Amino acid sequence: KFDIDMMVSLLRQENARDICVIQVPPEMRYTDYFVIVSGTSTRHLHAMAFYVVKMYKHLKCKRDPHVKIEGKDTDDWLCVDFGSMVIHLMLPETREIYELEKLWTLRSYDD
Template identity: 40%
Template sequence: MQIDALKTLVVDALEDIKAKDIALLDVSRLTSVTDWMVIASGTSTRHVAALANSVITSAKEKGIQPLGIEGENGSDWVLVDLGDLVVHVMMPETRTLYDLERLWADLPSDAAAFEDEAKA
């Protein structure tokens, strides 16, 4: 599946059950682990689990098997790894505490780190 179609699938799955504050981050220049991160908030731990489950179900319906799922069952943060795209569904307090949007925005890219090493 093309990355744009995967992003749309994930955002639609989150919007279908009322995720809050959905953010898409292009991290392809910052890490080789994944290309995109989607971050969304839920209103309760049950809502967070339901949002993650919606993403998982939608992905599986399109033949995409998640590579990993972390933090299910009453957690403040559930991560769904879809390979080129990683989904973080969090309680607002947890999202504020870890502030992934700022963290990933402030990191130097792998290319910049490589250039700095080459200069040293």
């Protein structure tokens, strides 16, 4: 299967400079897992995103529709939305300026 375990294994295999996972509660109508990962550079981000996407494509779930790769034109933030999990690849400055962690853990308790 293609699950968060496969996600984290692949990301650690390619050695993401930083990984974080959020368990999105069911009552929020987005997804199950919110993965946020930092990278060294835009080239690194593109490489790892392409790698994980190829792994998803080749692994399993033929009936599951294919998956976009969003943020290709931008250099500091890519994102891939899977059926039940969404990965946000970015750089340290983008991550610290968008503070997705506080947003997705403290839904209405931050600025």
